[PDB]
């Protein structure tokens, strides 16, 4: 997942005394949909995407069509 | 009085028996399917040392063979399989005539018409579909279909009119008439998903069952809910008798053979009672089918055996 869900950059910046190293690492958030850019599953703990429906009211009858 | 004796038991499978069928043209054949991904055609000797030997073994599937049915001539045989395809066999050496291409998921149920020109299929696609014998799609049903998996479809014997049964896991039984492909009716009933349905040889009835394990009776043409019977824990397969008005219900530890006129249980078939514990001490019975003689019936179990019985007076 490190290849998809993060980007990482490095830039050197000078000053009058030596060099300072900057590094920035940022994590991409998309999981529901789109662009689609990074893939929809979650990275580190890969979650079970769970919809819900649950009803019954059934009783016996014949309904002609 | 008409009662049952344990006839014998067949052997020759590595996978659970899924279905059995028999052609009345040759009652000396019998056909079987299994989760060893092969359908086995038998050679029945009536010796009680055995009761039959496998003649040939038809091969070529990459997943289970769910249901199987014979031709009306007995010279062809057809299969429905969880690899999403069907095959049309030539039951003389092997050599498939045709394989039917097009489903995205399993083909659970399948049946073969009386005129040998219409072949249907139930799928986990949530589509009933019709198939020419040339192996192309006459029609596809995707409107007013089940909202869950299609459990079993049937061709109905009738005076001449086209009627086909359909039942799914959405706890409904839909009856369809061809050449408009409409809902003839919707029958509501049974708590829990439907496993099976079967039609009377006369054809005016639909004996249905499922997870509920209750046997409700419906009228094909009247469209009325006759009654309900307590059929035990679960009923996976049903089959009317050809020469009686009985109904034979396949429950886990036993098969319950019911006389219909009057409504009562004749006997309960018990197999070997060998000591085992605890979740399914005997194997569940899952399929069953009568012979055309009506003396003998057969059963599918999950121990890879087909147990035989015979009626004795």
Curated annotation (Swiss-Prot), chain A:
It comes from the Eukaryota. One of its GO terms (biological process) is cell division. The modification Phosphoserine is found at residues 47, 62. There is a cross-link at residues 40, 52 (Glycyl lysine isopeptide (Lys-Gly) (interchain with G-Cter in ubiquitin)). Keywords: Acetylation, Apoptosis, Cell cycle, Cell division, Cytoplasm, Cytoskeleton, DNA damage, DNA repair, DNA-binding, Isopeptide bond, Lyase, Membrane, Methylation, Mitochondrion, Mitochondrion inner membrane, Mitosis, Nucleus, Phosphoprotein, Ribonucleoprotein, Ribosomal protein, RNA-binding, Transcription, Transcription regulation, Translation regulation, Ubl conjugation. Methylation by PRMT1 is required for import into the nucleolus and for ribosome assembly. There is a cross-link at residue 52 (Glycyl lysine isopeptide (Lys-Gly) (interchain with G-Cter in SUMO2)). The modification Phosphothreonine is found at residues 58-59. Belongs to the universal ribosomal protein uS3 family. Component of the small ribosomal subunit. The ribosome is a large ribonucleoprotein complex responsible for the synthesis of proteins in the cell. Has endonuclease activity and plays a role in repair of damaged DNA. Cleaves phosphodiester bonds of DNAs containing altered bases with broad specificity and cleaves supercoiled DNA more efficiently than relaxed DNA. Displays high binding affinity for 7,8-dihydro-8-oxoguanine (8-oxoG), a common DNA lesion caused by reactive oxygen species (ROS). Has also been shown to bind with similar affinity to intact and damaged DNA. This is Small ribosomal subunit protein uS3. The gene is RPS3.
Curated annotation (Swiss-Prot), chain B:
It is found in: Cell membrane; Cytoplasm; Cytoplasm, Perinuclear region; Nucleus. It comes from the Eukaryota. The keyword Ribonucleoprotein applies. The modification Phosphoserine is found at residues 275, 277-278. PANTHER family: RECEPTOR FOR ACTIVATED PROTEIN KINASE C RACK1. This is Small ribosomal subunit protein RACK1. The modification N6-acetyllysine is found at residues 129, 182. It comes from Oryctolagus cuniculus (Rabbit). The gene is RACK1. WD repeats lie at residues 12-43, 60-90, 102-132, 145-177, 189-219, 230-259, 280-310.
């Amino acid at each position: 997942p490190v290849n998809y869900y993060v980007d990482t950059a490095v830039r050197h910046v000078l000053l009058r005394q030596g060099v300072l190293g900057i590094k920035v690492k940022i994590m991409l958030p998309w999981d529901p949909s789109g662009k689609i850019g990074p893939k929809k599953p979650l990275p580190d703990h890969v979650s079970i995407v769970e919809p819900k429906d649950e009803i019954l009211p059934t009783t016996p009858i014949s309904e002609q069509k | 009085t008409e009662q049952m004796t344990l006839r014998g038991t067949l052997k020759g499978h590595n996978g659970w028996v899924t279905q059995i069928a028999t052609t009345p043209q040759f009652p000396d054949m019998i056909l079987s399917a299994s989760r060893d991904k092969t359908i086995i055609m038998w050679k029945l000797t009536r010796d009680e040392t055995n009761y039959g030997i496998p003649q040939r073994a038809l091969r070529g599937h990459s997943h289970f063979v769910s249901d199987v049915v014979i031709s009306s001539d007995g010279q062809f045989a057809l299969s429905g399989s969880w690899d999403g395809t069907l095959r049309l066999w030539d039951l003389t050496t092997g050599t498939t005539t045709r394989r039917f291409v097009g489903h995205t998921k399993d083909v659970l149920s399948v049946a073969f018409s009386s005129d040998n020109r219409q072949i249907v299929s139930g799928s986990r696609d949530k589509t009933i579909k019709l198939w020419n014998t040339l192996g192309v799609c006459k029609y596809t049903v995707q409107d007013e279909s089940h909202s869950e998996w299609v459990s079993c479809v049937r061709f109905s014997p009738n005076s001449s009119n086209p009627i086909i049964v359909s039942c799914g896991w959405d706890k409904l039984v839909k009856v369809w008439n061809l050449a408009n492909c409409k809902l003839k009716t919707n029958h509501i009933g049974h708590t829990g998903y439907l496993n099976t349905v079967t039609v009377s040889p006369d054809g005016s009835l639909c004996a249905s069952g499922g997870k509920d394990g209750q046997a409700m009776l419906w009228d094909l043409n009247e469209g009325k809910h006759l009654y309900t019977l307590d059929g035990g824990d679960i009923i996976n397969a049903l089959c009317f008798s050809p020469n009686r008005y009985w109904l034979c219900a396949a429950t886990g530890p036993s098969i319950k053979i019911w006389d219909l006129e009057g409504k009562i249980i004749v006997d309960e078939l018990k197999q070997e009672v060998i000591s085992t514990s605890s979740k399914a001490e005997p194997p569940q019975c899952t399929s069953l089918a009568w012979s055309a003689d009506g003396q003998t019936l057969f059963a599918g179990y999950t121990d890879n055996l087909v147990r035989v019985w015979q009626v004795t007076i």
